[PDB]
Write a protein that binds this ligand. Structure first.
Ligand SMILES: Cc1nnc(C(C)C)n1[C@@H]1C[C@H]2CC[C@@H](C1)N2CC[C@H](NC(=O)C1CCCC1)c1cccs1
Ligand SMILES: [Zn+2]
Length: 339
């Protein structure tokens, strides 16, 4: 193997220090705004706080990985298992809360009348604790294999799998991270945003550019054969404006009025940004462990893919300081609050 450790000792400590500062300040501001300004009045507000905590737990580990890159593992065994633990917990709960935010929006938008009954602060609180328990238990096998050890003269913090079962463990721990961190959020994204997009469209108002008439799907146009609850897009093209009598071509889409519909932009941005930072590691991890059989094992491609894993995971670690920026730009409340 090629020694990149001499290079990593120079590069990673300043990089990890910026990410820690920027990310700690950013996530802390989100937390004080949600508890003090916003005061946690919705189910959404509970999951946002918990997501902000998941980013923080993960962030606290970053100064330790920085020092370990710089020098060696000077924190000991418990610390090695704790920080590896917090890293995995912070990772799993983070994506679990991105999934819970998506499901919350699917309920508010798709099952609106039910959501009034189901979406409460206390149900959001109850589901958060369950999520944390699931995350800790998802991280637990990984914490077991992790330990501090003196290899000759230097102290290391790594996970070591039993030699007689090494391929099995690499195989299994890869599929836990890929199923939970890529596959599971992707099915949640496709299934949920299918329903959300279909509800958003079937409920879109359209205004006539000529007379100003507003077509509302809820009302329809029953005097002209258009039954209430009809997507304007589903109306036959032989239909004309009830006021000025012009065709569908002259109709323009009305900008979203419903706040619950407007909040979709934020929660979808969070998920898409998660995939930009973490889908690269997930694919390289799957390519490394498994695809060696289904691709290449060369001393070149083995060293290339292992370096690719080092890069793609540093990129993912960066994601912990990204959500505050999203809230500052896309987040409507946060925008007016700062204004
Ligand atoms: C050490 C060290 N220096 N920097 C880092 C990253 C922040 C870039 N690291 C560690 C942090 C943790 C602890 C080891 C590894 C690199 N990292 C955990 C990576 C772990 N992926 C796996 O365990 C794979 C290896 C092959 C089978 C599973 C992840 C856990 C959650 C996301 S990634
Ligand atoms: Zn008209």
């Amino acid at each position: 193997k090629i020694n990149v450790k001499q290079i990593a000792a120079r590069l990673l400590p300043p990089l990890y220090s910026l990410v820690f500062i920027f990310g700690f300040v950013g996530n802390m501001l989100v937390i004080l705004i949600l508890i003090n300004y916003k005061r946690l009045k919705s189910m959404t507000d509970i999951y946002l706080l918990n997501l902000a905590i998941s980013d923080l737990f993960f962030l606290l580990t970053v100064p330790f990985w920085a020092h370990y890159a710089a020098a060696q593992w000077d924190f000991g065994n418990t610390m090695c298992q704790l920080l590896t633990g917090l890293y995995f917990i912070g990772f799993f709960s983070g994506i679990f809360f991105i999934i819970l935010l998506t499901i919350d929006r699917y309920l508010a938008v798709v099952h609106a009348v039910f959501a009034l009954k189901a979406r409460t602060v206390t149900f959001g609180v109850v589901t958060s604790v369950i999520t944390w328990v699931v995350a800790v238990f998802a991280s637990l096998p990984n914490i077991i294999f992790t330990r501090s050890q003196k290899e000759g003269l230097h102290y290391t913090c790594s996970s070591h799998f039993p030699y007689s079962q090494y391929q099995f463990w690499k195989n299994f721990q890869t599929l836990k991270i890929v199923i939970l961190g890529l596959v599971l959020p992707l099915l949640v994204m496709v299934i949920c945003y299918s329903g959300i997009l279909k509800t958003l469209l079937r409920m879109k108002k359209y205004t006539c550019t000529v007379c100003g008439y507003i077509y509302n799907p809820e009302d329809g146009d029953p005097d002209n054969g258009v039954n209430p609850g009809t997507d304007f897009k589903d109306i036959p093209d032989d239909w004309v404006c009830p006021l000025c009598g012009v065709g569908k071509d002259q109709f323009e889409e009305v900008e979203e009025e419903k706040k619950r519909h407007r909040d979709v932009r934020l929660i979808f941005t969070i998920m898409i940004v998660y995939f930009l930072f973490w889908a690269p590691y997930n694919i390289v991890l799957l390519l490394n462990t498994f695809q060696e059989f289904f691709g290449l094992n060369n001393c070149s491609s083995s060293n290339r893919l292992d370096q690719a894993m080092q890069v793609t995971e540093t990129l993912g670690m960066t994601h912990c300081c990204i959500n505050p920026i999203i809230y500052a730009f896309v987040g409507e409340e946060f925008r007016n609050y700062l204004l």
